[PDB]
Design a protein around this ligand. Structure first.
Ligand SMILES: O=C(O)[C@H]1/C(=C/CO)O[C@@H]2CC(=O)N21
Ligand SMILES: O=C(O)[C@H]1/C(=C/CO)O[C@@H]2CC(=O)N21
Length: 420
């Protein structure tokens, strides 16, 4: 079990040796911090990416020593110590060819090793934040509850809704009304904001349903999700919710697109007040009228709107049911198409000797953070873990590393907390 010096050394060596998009980006970003040029920056970041002052300010906090290195597909974290025992984390999010989309250097997110479920609760609780932790073992005759805090509370879940979109898509594939190799076309009206990369493709770009669904899940791609939602039709997405495991489908009718949440939530305040006072009919009418190219930009987001219904609300039971249903859908799909999409990005470094398969999905919106996993061992025993936070102020929640890291610690301690 690695001592401090051992683990820091192992992290430093791993970072140097990481021959991958994350390795390349993490080494370059560390270079900015430890060294003593606008062209070289332009080339490392996404084309649509002040930074000189940002880097000066970061550099002033050093010198830095690498203490941990956590690459996970297109996301990565490097834990750094600066003088006098102060720690920071460098977070990286990459696009599909390894360009940097997000790069931040922030005070360390501290998550202790978990021994008990009470450790989880006492760590997570923040005044002003509603949270929920739900962990179950799935069995032939129902779920065994390992731990529950407020699983009955319906809460906003952001991109967790893409799990329902996935089930709706699979239901249509099974019916033969859509095919995995059918072509979807990106138009100006179908473009959404990140998370995701598909928005960066040119107008007219032709992409298969398979590759669109893959990015929808694996990259939480908002534009990919909206392409699927457009192809299926809102009625098909909605008509599905009851089957795919939702307790009060009226909470997600009309079933919003990401474009609609962004545009309604952070655009015209009058149009947003109209939503609030309208019934289901008036809301559908309002959405039809709002259809077109987005006006809202990433810079406009901030204020919370989930409390107005402009998000996707479900309880913890709903999340378990949709994941269990996807496990069932995957098994029925003998081609392995569903399984490949679901397992591409497990959100953490996974012990593959323990877990045969891991599904993962995150959701985030101002004032909203959630992470969920389905983990199935090699004997076939499945566990589901659902973590949720909502608040009236985004600063109370933060960038989501806290809640993700709590999940990481639970999964690390699975023998104590899940499978005991
Ligand atoms: O896919 C992930 O891991 C992303 C995400 C996506 C939801 O928009 O939300 C959480 C915060 C973050 O960086 N995670
Ligand atoms: O393994 C862990 O404990 C946590 C972590 C913590 C950052 O210090 O970083 C990676 C991402 C995550 O949730 N893991």
């Amino acid at each position: 079990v690695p001592t401090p010096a051992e683990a820091a050394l192992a992290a430093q060596t791993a970072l140097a040796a990481d021959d991958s998009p994350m390795g390349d980006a993490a080494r370059w970003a560390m270079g900015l911090l430890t060294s003593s040029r606008p062209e070289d920056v332009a080339a490392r970041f996404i084309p649509t990416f002040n930074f000189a002052e940002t880097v000066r300010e970061w550099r002033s906090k050093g010198p830095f020593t690498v203490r941990a290195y956590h690459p996970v597909a297109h996301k990565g974290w490097v834990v750094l110590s600066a003088p006098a025992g102060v720690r920071y984390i460098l977070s990286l999010t990459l696009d599909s060819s390894g360009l940097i989309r997000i790069l931040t250097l922030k005070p360390e997110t501290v998550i202790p090793d978990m021994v008990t479920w009470n450790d989880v609760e006492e760590t997570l609780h923040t005044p002003g934040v509603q949270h929920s932790v739900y962990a179950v073992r799935l069995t032939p005759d129902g779920h065994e509850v390992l731990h529950a805090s407020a699983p009955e509370r319906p809460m906003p879940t952001g991109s967790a809704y893409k799990l329902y979109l996935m089930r709706a898509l699979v239901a249509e594939i099974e019916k033969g009304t859509v095919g995995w190799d059918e072509i979807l076309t990106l138009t100006p009206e179908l473009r959404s904001l990140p998370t995701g990369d598909m928005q960066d493709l040119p107008d007219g770009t032709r992409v298969t349903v398979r590759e669109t669904a893959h990015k929808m899940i694996a990259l939480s791609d908002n534009t990919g999700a909206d392409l699927v939602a457009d192809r299926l039709g809102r009625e098909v997405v909605e008509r599905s919710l009851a089957a795919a495991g939702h307790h009060d489908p009226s909470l997600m009718r009309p079933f919003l697109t990401s474009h609609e949440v962004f545009e309604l939530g952070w655009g015209d305040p009058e149009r947003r007040a109209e939503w609030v006072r309208q019934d289901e009919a008036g809301r559908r009418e309002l959405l039809e009228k709002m259809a077109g190219v987005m006006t809202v930009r990433g810079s406009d987001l901030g204020a919370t709107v989930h409390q107005l219904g402009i998000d996707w609300h479900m309880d913890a039971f709903d999340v378990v049911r949709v994941l269990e249903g996807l496990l069932q859908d995957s098994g029925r799909d003998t081609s392995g198409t569903v399984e490949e999409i679901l397992t591409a990005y497990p959100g953490l470094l996974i012990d593959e000797e323990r877990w045969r398969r891991v599904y993962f999905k995150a959701g985030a919106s101002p004032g909203v953070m959630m992470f969920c996993w389905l983990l199935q061992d090699h004997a076939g025993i499945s566990y589901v873990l659902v973590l949720r936070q909502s608040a009236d102020e985004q600063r109370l929640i933060g960038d989501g590393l806290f809640l993700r890291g709590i999940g990481a610690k639970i999964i690390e301690a699975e023998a104590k907390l899940l499978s005991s």
